[PDB]
Amino acid sequence: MEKKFLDILVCPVTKGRLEYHQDKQELWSRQAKLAYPIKDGIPYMLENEARPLSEEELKALEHHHHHH
Structure with missing residues (x-):
């Protein structure tokens, strides 16, 4: 039942909702058209460190990515 506990990551x-993917530890947001970096649990939603997403990436947010 451990969801909505650590699973409350929002912009x-x-x-809006966020789903993280490992390897790069990136948070993807279509609602902001940006991606946030996670440093071992330290999300950097800072102007300097937050990077925009490409159209491809944005378009790949039509559904959950690597959630299954």
Whole structure:
């Protein structure tokens, strides 16, 4: 039942849902068109460290990615 516990990650502005993927530890947001970096549990939603997503990536947010 351990969801909505650590699974409450949302954007600081749009406050929409986020799903993380390992390897790069990136948070993808279509609602913000950005991607946030995670440093071992330290999300950097900072202007300097937050990077935009490409259209491809944006388009690949039509559904959950690597959730299954």
